[PDB]
Structure formats: structure tokens, C-alpha cells
Amino acid sequence: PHPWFFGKIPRAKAEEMLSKQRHDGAFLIRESESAPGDFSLSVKFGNDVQHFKVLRDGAGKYFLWVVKFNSLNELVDYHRSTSVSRNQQIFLRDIE
Amino acid sequence: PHPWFFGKIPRAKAEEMLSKQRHDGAFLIRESESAPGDFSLSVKFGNDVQHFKVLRDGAGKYFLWVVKFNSLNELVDYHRSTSVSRNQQIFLRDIE
Ligand SMILES: NC(=O)[C@H]1CCCC[C@H]1NC(=O)C1(NC(=O)[C@H](Cc2ccc(OP(=O)(O)O)cc2)NC(=O)OCc2cccc(N)c2)CCCCC1
Ligand SMILES: NC(=O)[C@H]1CCCC[C@H]1NC(=O)C1(NC(=O)[C@H](Cc2ccc(OP(=O)(O)O)cc2)NC(=O)OCc2cccc(N)c2)CCCCC1
């Protein structure tokens, strides 16, 4: 059962928790509060926590920037090895 | 972190696992293999395991039959107390 799926929690709690984490890339997927039906990827990086809105196309694939995936699961794993950001190199790693 | 979110697993493994469970209502949400981008709710009931396709409307709310929710989280909790089925009375309960 995935350890990164936190269901519907408030952005700030995600921040509060993640800020407590030790490694850059620790993340969780949460269900959006501001954007009902949208997922939000939260990841730790340095002093801050960043959030990426998970997009979904007309065919329903999800993606962050351009490469499409047919599941949060896939998208998550994929970025475990391909930066989630384009400025910095941030790789997802399971929270502790 | 929710114990019912299994990410993307094959329907049959869900069946295999759930069949092993002890109580009617033990369930998990899995990402659909046949319907990419769609979630599937699997629940145990008697000898069988049932699957409900999780619908999503144009506003993006999710639902199973008619009452809409803005998150799998909510939808899941709600049915912990309101049968997921209309013939039988099946309530979600966390897997073991
Ligand atoms: N997929 C992406 O997020 C890419 C591609 C599309 C747009 C933007 C890209 N993302 C980004 O540039 C970055 N993120 C963003 O632009 C994020 C994307 C996002 C938008 C809404 C969200 O709603 P929620 O918080 O209730 O769940 C969550 C995430 N935007 C963002 O944080 O805006 C500020 C913010 C502050 C307070 C409330 C909200 N909703 C949003 C990358 C990380 C640093 C900040 C910029
Ligand atoms: N939300 C629902 O599922 C309600 C409302 C809309 C349609 C049907 C309703 N569901 C149902 O009647 C019941 N379920 C159904 O009709 C389910 C709904 C569903 C459809 C596709 C799915 O794809 P996946 O397996 O790869 O994830 C998963 C679930 N249908 C179903 O099991 O069809 C048989 C089946 C067999 C083999 C492969 C597939 N995909 C489907 C309730 C439980 C007993 C069976 C009937």
C-alpha cells in the first residue's frame, strides 16, 4: 500500500510535515483542497517545500510538465529518477 | 497515510488479496489498469470481491452512484457508513 498517498490533507499540514523531513525529495501526493478533484505533489527541498499541481489531459493521462503517465503510481515512480523540477534536480524519495 | 490506497495493481491481485480477507467490506482503492486514469474500488463480500468503477463528473467530483465528493478520501470515508451497494448492505472497512 503506498506510503506516499496522504489522501486529503491541507497544504499547510503537508508543509509542516515535510519541513520536518530530512532529505530533499521526500514527498507525498495529497488530494487538492483548493482544486477539488486535482492532486498535488508536495516535495521537500532545502528550507522550502514545493508543490506541483498534477495535470491531467483530455485523455485522462496525468503529468507534470510534458511526459504523460496513466497513473499517479507511474508518474510517482518515474520521477523517482527524473527531476520533478526543471531548475533544480529534485528526485522523489519516500518520506520517513 | 492511508492504508487503503494500493496504487496501480492488477484487478486479479486485488481479488486474490481481498478474497483472503476476513470481513465483508474490507476494501482498497486501486488505479485502473483497464481504464487508465480511472480508480476502482474493490471490496470483499461473501465469496466474491466486487468492484465499483469510481466515476467522476464534469466538475471533477468523484462518486459511485449519485452523491458527489471532492476526493477519494471523502468518498471512502463516507461509505464507511453508507452501503456501497444498493442491493446488499456493504460498508467499507479497512483491510488487515
Ligand atoms: N505541474 C506544475 O505544477 C508545473 C507545471 C504547471 C504550472 C506550474 C508548474 N509548477 C511550478 O512552477 C511550481 N509550482 C506551482 O506553480 C504550484 C502549482 C500548484 C498550484 C496549485 C496548488 O493547489 P493546492 O496547494 O491547494 O494543492 C498546488 C500546486 N503553484 C503554487 O504553489 O502557487 C502558489 C500557491 C499558494 C497558495 C495556494 C495555492 N493553491 C497555490 C513548481 C514548484 C515551485 C513553484 C512553482
Ligand atoms: N460505480 C459503479 O461501479 C456502479 C455505477 C456505474 C456502473 C455500475 C455500478 N457498479 C456495479 O453495478 C457493479 N460493478 C460493476 O458494474 C463494475 C464496475 C467496474 C467497471 C470496470 C472496472 O475496470 P477494472 O476492473 O480494470 O478496474 C472496474 C469496475 N463492472 C465490472 O466489474 O464489469 C466486469 C469486469 C470484468 C473484467 C474486467 C472489467 N474491467 C470489468 C457493482 C458491484 C458488482 C458488479 C456490478
What residue of A is the nearest CA neighbor of B58?
A37
In degrees, to the nearest 5, what angle opens at C-alpha B94 toward C-alphas B88 and B96? 115
**CATH fold for the domain made of B1-96:** SHC Adaptor Protein (3.30.505)
Residues with CB under 6 A from ligand 2: B 11, 32-35, 40, 50-53, 55, 64-65
Angstrom distances, CA of residue A28 to CA of A14, B4, B30, B95: 8, 15, 17, 22
Distance (Å, rounded) from C-alpha A45 to C-alpha A90? 7
- Residue A33, SS3 per DSSP: coil
Distance (Å, rounded) from C-alpha A47 to C-alpha A22? 10
What residue of A is the nearest CA neighbor of B31?
A71
Please name the helix (run of DSSP H) or strand (run of DSSP E) that holds residue A30, with its range, or none. Answer: strand A26-31
Q: Which residues does A46 contact at the CB level (< 8 Å), separation at least 6?
A: A24
Listed resolution, Å? 3.0
Q: Where are the domains of chain A?
A: 1-96
Question: B77: left (phi > 0), else alpha (psi -120 to 50), else beta?
Answer: alpha
